[PDB]
C-alpha cells in the first residue's frame, strides 16, 4: 500500500482553499485570505509539492503573482523565475525580477539553495542560470531583458584544462561536469543569444561552429549533440544571408567591414570570410544564390560574351584553345597586359 | 532523467547499501543482467549505461 506522496501529510481546510484559489485564479479569495488570516502559512504545498507562487506562475496568473510577491516571507522565488522563463511568460518574469532578491542583477548569472523547489533538488540542473534557460527556450525578449541587467553565459574552458576548479568538478562528478559543459554550449550556440549578445554575429557564429566541430571529434561521447549545435550555428548564418535585399547587405554578410579590410588582388571583393566558410565547411552559406551571384562575377571576370553563351559553344572554345595553345603561350610570354593578356 | 552519477547508479544498479559489492572494485551488475535476459534493448543501448 505504497504511494508517491510529496508531502506525506494532510492539508488543512483553510489551506486547500488557498491553494485552489491560487491555482484556479480566484483573486478576491486570495486578497481576503492574505490579509484577514494570520494563522495561514503561505508556503503550504499540495500533493506534488508546489506552493501558491509555483501554482500561480505555472498557470499565468499575473495578479495573484503580484499579490503574493509583496509578502517578504515566500520561498521558491528563483524557481518561480526559472519556471516563468521556461514557459515564456514575459510579464511574470518582469514582475518577479522586481522582487528585492534580483536587485542589482545579483543571481542572473554563474551552493546557495536559491533555485531549489523541493528542499531536495532543483527543477532544472544546478548549472542552469536564468540566461542559459532563456537562451535554450529561444525567448528573445527575456534574453534582451536579462542582457540589459548584465547577465552573460560564461564560455567553458578547454577539454584538457587543469585549473584548480576544473579538476575539483571532475573529481566530484564527471557526469554533471560534461552535462554542464554541454548546457553552456547549448546556451551559447542559440540564435537568441548570438543575435543579441555580440557586435558581429556572423564572425562569432563561424568561430563557434568551428569550435563545436572540433569538440565533436576531441570529445568522443556527446558527438551527436555537438554536431547538432554546430549545424544550428551554421543555420544562423545561412538564415541571416537570406534576409538581404540590397547589394550592400549582401556584401556586408559575405564580406566583412569593407572600409577596414584590404581591397584584394584585382577590382574584386575581399574573399577572406568566404574562404573561412569553405575551410570551416559551411556548405549552405557557399551554395546560396546570393553567394553564387558574387562568385560567378569573379569567375567570368573579363568575359561578358562567354557568360551568356550556351553549352556546345564552350566545348568549341576548349577545342580552339587546344588547337592554338602555343600562340597564346607566346602572347602571354612576350606581350602581357593587353586585350588578350 | 538522471543528472548526477548516484542517480545513474540507482537506476542501473539497485539499492547499493543492501546489495553485494560484486567481484572486484566494480558495481553490482544484477539488474543489468536481468535487462539483458528480459531483452530490454534501449536500456542497455543508452549512453548512461
Amino acid at each position: 500500500a505504497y504511494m508517491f506522496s510529496d508531502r506525506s501529510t494532510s492539508l488543512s481546510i483553510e489551506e486547500e482553499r488557498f491553494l485552489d484559489a491560487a491555482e484556479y485564479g480566484n483573486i478576491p479569495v486570495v486578497r481576503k485570505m492574505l490579509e484577514e488570516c494570520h494563522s495561514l502559512n503561505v508556503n503550504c504545498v499540495d500533493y506534488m509539492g508546489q506552493n501558491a507562487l509555483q501554482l500561480a506562475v505555472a498557470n499565468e496568473h499575473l495578479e495573484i503573482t503580484e499579490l503574493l510577491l509583496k509578502k517578504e516571507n515566500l520561498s521558491r522565488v528563483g524557481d518561480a523565475l526559472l519556471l516563468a522563463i521556461s514557459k515564456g511568460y514575459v510579464r511574470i518574469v518582469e514582475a518577479i525580477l522586481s522582487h528585492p532578491a534580483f536587485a542589482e542583477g545579483k543571481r542572473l548569472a554563474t551552493q546557495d539553495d536559491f533555485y531549489a523547489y523541493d528542499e531536495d533538488g532543483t527543477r532544472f540542473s544546478h548549472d542552469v542560470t536564468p540566461i542559459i534557460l532563456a537562451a535554450h527556450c529561444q525567448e528573445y525578449e527575456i534574453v534582451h531583458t536579462l542582457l540589459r541587467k548584465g547577465a552573460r553565459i560564461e564560455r567553458p574552458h578547454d577539454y584538457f584544462c587543469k585549473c584548480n576548479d576544473c579538476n575539483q568538478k571532475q573529481k566530484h562528478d564527471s557526469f554533471s561536469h560534461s552535462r554542464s559543459r554541454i548546457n553552456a554550449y547549448k546556451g551559447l550556440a542559440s540564435p537568441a543569444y548570438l543575435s543579441l549578445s555580440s557586435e558581429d554575429p556572423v564572425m562569432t557564429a563561424l568561430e563557434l561552429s568551428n569550435e563545436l566541430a572540433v569538440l565533436a571529434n576531441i570529445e568522443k561521447e556527446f558527438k551527436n549533440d555537438y554536431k547538432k549545435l554546430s549545424m544550428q550555428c551554421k543555420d544562423f548564418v545561412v538564415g541571416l544571408l537570406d534576409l538581404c535585399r540590397n547589394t550592400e547587405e549582401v556584401e556586408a554578410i559575405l564580406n566583412g567591414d569593407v572600409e577596414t579590410l584590404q581591397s584584394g588582388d584585382h577590382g574584386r571583393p575581399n574573399l577572406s570570410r568566404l574562404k573561412l566558410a569553405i575551410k570551416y565547411e559551411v556548405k549552405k552559406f557557399v551554395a546560396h544564390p546570393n553567394c553564387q551571384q558574387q562568385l560567378l562575377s569573379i569567375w567570368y571576370e573579363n568575359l561578358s560574351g562567354l557568360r551568356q553563351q550556351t553549352m556546345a559553344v564552350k566545348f568549341l572554345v576548349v577545342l580552339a584553345v587546344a588547337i592554338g595553345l602555343p600562340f597564346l603561350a607566346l602572347i602571354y610570354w612576350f606581350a602581357p597586359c593587353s586585350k588578350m593578356g | 532523467l538522471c543528472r548526477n552519477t548516484e542517480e545513474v547508479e540507482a537506476i542501473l544498479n539497485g539499492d547499493v547499501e543492501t546489495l553485494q559489492s560484486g567481484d572486484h572494485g566494480r558495481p553490482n551488475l544484477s539488474r543489468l543482467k536481468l535487462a539483458i535476459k528480459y531483452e530490454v534493448k534501449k536500456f542497455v543501448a543508452h549512453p548512461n549505461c
Binding site: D118, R123 | L1, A10, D15
Partner: peptide
C-alpha cells in the same frame, strides 16, 4: 536512506516531465 530519496526525486521528475510532454500534444476539436 539514500536510495529512497533518489527514487523519490526521480519519480517526481518523471511525473512533472510526463505532464509537460502531455501538454505538448496538438490541440484537437474537443
Amino acid at each position: 536512506r539514500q536510495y529512497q530519496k533518489i527514487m523519490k526525486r526521480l519519480i517526481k521528475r518523471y511525473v512533472l516531465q510526463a505532464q509537460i510532454d502531455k501538454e505538448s500534444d496538438e490541440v484537437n476539436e474537443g
